Enzyme design. Structure first.
Site, mmCIF file in Angstrom:
data_model
loop_
_atom_site.group_PDB
_atom_site.id
_atom_site.type_symbol
_atom_site.label_atom_id
_atom_site.label_comp_id
_atom_site.label_asym_id
_atom_site.label_seq_id
_atom_site.Cartn_x
_atom_site.Cartn_y
_atom_site.Cartn_z
ATOM 1 N N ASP A 145 40.570 1.505 24.041
ATOM 2 C CA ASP A 145 39.812 2.386 23.165
ATOM 3 C C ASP A 145 39.901 1.833 21.753
ATOM 4 O O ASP A 145 40.590 0.833 21.489
ATOM 5 C CB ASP A 145 40.300 3.848 23.275
ATOM 6 N N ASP B 121 40.674 3.089 17.731
ATOM 7 C CA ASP B 121 41.322 4.131 16.939
ATOM 8 C C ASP B 121 40.977 3.959 15.468
ATOM 9 O O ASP B 121 41.169 2.873 14.909
ATOM 10 C CB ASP B 121 42.862 4.094 17.124
ATOM 11 N N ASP C 97 38.805 7.238 19.177
ATOM 12 C CA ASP C 97 39.593 8.299 18.570
ATOM 13 C C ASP C 97 39.374 8.274 17.062
ATOM 14 O O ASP C 97 39.484 7.215 16.438
ATOM 15 C CB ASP C 97 41.084 8.147 18.866
HETATM 16 MN MN LIG Z 1 43.434 5.983 21.224
HETATM 17 MN MN LIG Z 2 43.916 2.319 21.194
#
Ligand SMILES: [Mn+2]
Ligand SMILES: [Mn+2]
Ligand SMILES: [Mn+2]
Ligand SMILES: [Mn+2]
Ligand SMILES: [Mn+2]
Ligand SMILES: [Mn+2]
Ligand code: NA
Length: 326
Positions: A193, A195, A250
């Site tokens: 992912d 961030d 995120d």
């Molecule tokens: Mn994350």
């Molecule tokens: Mn990450």
DNA sequence: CGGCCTACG
DNA sequence: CGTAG
DNA sequence: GCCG
């Protein structure tokens, strides 16, 4: 070798990769059985090996290393002598391990849910798709997007994604900034992912920002899934040649007074930060989180203007992000 | 033996 | 219960 | 599972 991971540099690549991976399998399996203590010891032992300056070739080189007892030492001994550890391989091929790994990989599914599904007899993603009324909205999103979300995010993808987040953030609050955190800030070339940490130089101006950012990203058609708030766990549509793919993103907001703590916490690694919080409390008597550093005897919060400040407060030599890969 | 990070959605 | 490093 |  110091006993806490925050006391030693840990680079992203190292000289004991095979040994650390085997111990991390056992750590993961311990987590699936709810034994956080065993998970921590196996993670810590793996991290010690990542911090060594050269390969372990002989069992003798483990004497004196922290977090190596009978069990972790036997794993390494079997790898050194046979190239495989029977316990590790038995875990790897076990139905329990493979299914808990598959289920917990789903966004919206933790160990407790995966374990319940396991006990009910469920084993595959298609098993879960054939009973969709039992799923939360989050789990449905995680299951629909599971294939894309299993594909690594490339550092090459992150730049384009940051500029679209910056565009929305700048409309939502001019002057607000976006900082890449997580594994990419530690130098990883891939990740599960992306961030991002958002702040504004004028204290208080960040209040109410994240809903304004999310609405704007949603109006741009970029949000495949998202739930006042300050953390958002999203699925974003990311361009691809002639198409697109789903990516987990995120977004976190912090006031600038807290930014060094939030940057530190969100840059990780996860084990590094657990160890740093443990060190703070047990060795220094101070309480650390992503908002601040509290002295419970004087009832005061430490002001920090930088990550460097925070390491100094805690009596630790500064480690840049690329040496926090515990 | 107790402890094992510490939050937010 | 989920999520974050 | 290991430290302290
Ligand atoms: Mn994350
Ligand atoms: Mn990450
Ligand atoms: Mn030992
Ligand atoms: Mn043997
Ligand atoms: Mn807060
Ligand atoms: Mn994670
Ligand atoms: Na999950």
């Amino acid at each position: 070798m110091p006993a806490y991971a925050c006391q030693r540099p840990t680079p992203l690549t190292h000289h004991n990769t095979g040994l650390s991976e085997a111990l991390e399998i056992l750590a993961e399996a311990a987590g699936f059985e709810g034994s956080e203590g065993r998970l921590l010891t196996f993670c810590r032992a793996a991290s010690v090996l990542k911090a060594l300056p050269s390969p372990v070739t002989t069992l003798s080189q483990l004497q004196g290393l922290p977090h190596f007892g009978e069990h972790s030492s036997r794993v390494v001994q079997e790898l050194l002598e046979h190239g495989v550890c029977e316990e590790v391989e038995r875990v790897r091929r076990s139905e329990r391990y493979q299914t808990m790994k598959l289920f917990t990989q789903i966004f919206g599914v933790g160990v407790k849910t995966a374990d319940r599904w396991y006990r009910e007899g469920l084993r595959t993603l298609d098993d879960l798709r054939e009973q969709p009324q039992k799923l939360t909205q989050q789990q449905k999103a995680g299951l629909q997007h599971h294939q894309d979300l299993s594909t690594p995010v490339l550092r090459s993808d992150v730049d384009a994604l940051q500029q679209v987040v910056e565009e929305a953030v700048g409309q939502a609050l001019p002057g607000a900034t976006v900082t890449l955190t997580g594994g990419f800030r530690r130098g990883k070339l891939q990740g599960h992912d992306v961030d991002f940490l958002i702040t504004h130089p004028k204290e208080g101006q960040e209040a109410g920002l994240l809903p304004r950012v999310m609405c704007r990203l949603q109006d741009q058609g970029l949000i495949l899934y998202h739930q006042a708030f300050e953390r958002s766990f999203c699925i974003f549509r990311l361009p691809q040649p002639g198409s697109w793919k789903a990516v987990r993103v995120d977004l976190v907001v912090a006031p600038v007074s807290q930014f060094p703590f939030a940057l530190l916490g969100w840059t990780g690694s996860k084990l590094f930060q657990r160890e740093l919080r443990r060190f703070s409390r047990k060795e220094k008597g101070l309480w650390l989180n992503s908002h601040g550093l509290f002295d419970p005897e004087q009832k005061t919060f430490f002001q920090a203007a930088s990550e460097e400040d925070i390491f100094r407060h805690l009596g630790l030599e500064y480690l840049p992000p690329e040496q926090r890969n515990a």
